[PDB]
């Protein structure tokens, strides 16, 4: 019963930094993107106008992660039954490679869409109590930034929520295109960068302690 705060894939320092500077360059480009500035109203006075690198500038520092299960040390929400899975134990501390299909921004959060492998999905838990009509692991994400009081698993709920729009074809076609991928918009600040090339990152399926 040596359970962590939460299971998940924790990117390397290298890759995590790679995802960061790419995430920040995404924030910068979309901020200066014309069409984004056209829907700047949907995202008192224009003292700062809008600088996205500062809008979610608050970002928990360290290695990024895609949380599978939140344990809280010991069975909090069936966590000890998660850790009892031979798949989880055999995978604990092992190395894995996550695939960042597409980055995204929303008025609440900003993150990355992780498309887990079948082997990586064996870990992902279907327990929690927009997910309707979307395949398993669709919640798989990596929070890259939250604007102040946006304080929960909201980048995963946003990502899934943005994936519901696309489910029905709300993508809205290429609203434009940034470097390293294509751009779309589907609602109030519901912008999405579909990376033309998957940003594959290196991570380890361990758990946090602290």
């Amino acid at each position, epitope marked *: 019963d040596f359970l962590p705060l939460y299971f998940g894939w924790f990117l390397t320092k290298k890759s995590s930094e790679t995802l960061r500077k790419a995430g920040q360059v995404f924030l910068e480009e979309l901020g200066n993107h014309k069409a984004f500035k056209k829907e700047l109203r949907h995202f008192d006075e224009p003292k700062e106008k809008l600088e996205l690198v500062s809008y979610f500038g608050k970002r928990p520092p360290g290695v990024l992660h895609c949380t599978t299960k939140f344990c809280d040390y010991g069975k909090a929400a069936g966590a000890e039954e998660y850790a009892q899975q031979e798949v989880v134990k055999r995978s604990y501390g*092992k190395a894995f490679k996550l695939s960042i299909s597409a980055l995204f921004v929303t008025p609440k959060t900003a993150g990355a869409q992780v498309v887990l492998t079948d082997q990586e999905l064996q870990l992902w838990p279907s327990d929690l109590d927009a997910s309707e009509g979307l395949p398993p692991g669709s919640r798989a994400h990596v929070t890259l930034g939250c604007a102040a009081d946006v304080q929960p698993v909201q980048t995963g709920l946003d990502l899934l929520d943005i994936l519901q729009q696309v489910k029905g074809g709300s993508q809205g076609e290429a609203v434009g295109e940034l470097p390293r991928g294509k751009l779309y918009s589907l609602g109030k600040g519901r912008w999405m960068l579909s990376l033309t090339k998957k940003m594959e990152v*290196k991570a380890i399926f361990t*758990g946090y302690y602290g």
Partner: nanobody
Amino acid sequence: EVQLLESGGGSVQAGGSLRLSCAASGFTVGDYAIGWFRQAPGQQREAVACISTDDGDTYYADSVKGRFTISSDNAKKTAYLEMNNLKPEDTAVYHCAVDGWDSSCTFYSPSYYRDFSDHGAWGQGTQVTVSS
């Protein structure tokens, strides 16, 4: 063929000094991090230190700071822990651990766990035993 050739330990007395040397093989230079973990009998392993063959940056447990000093002859692909002021509470079977996945010291941090058998290596044993 990843294999760690650790050595340089043994029995000493309090206040003494040792030098654990780990010649890691089977990894490139700059994409691995080499550091020892000491796991005393009946306690949990703790990262004593590591050194990144890329950054050249080192980590130390607070208890071993200034007393132990890790180093890496990246060319020879070996690392050395310069243990000093060794106390009896530093008795354990020190284990050279190389992280090939992350040249960082990130997973030497006590906040995570890294099975060094996946993309790294685990030293069998260099037994340190301080006395008096």
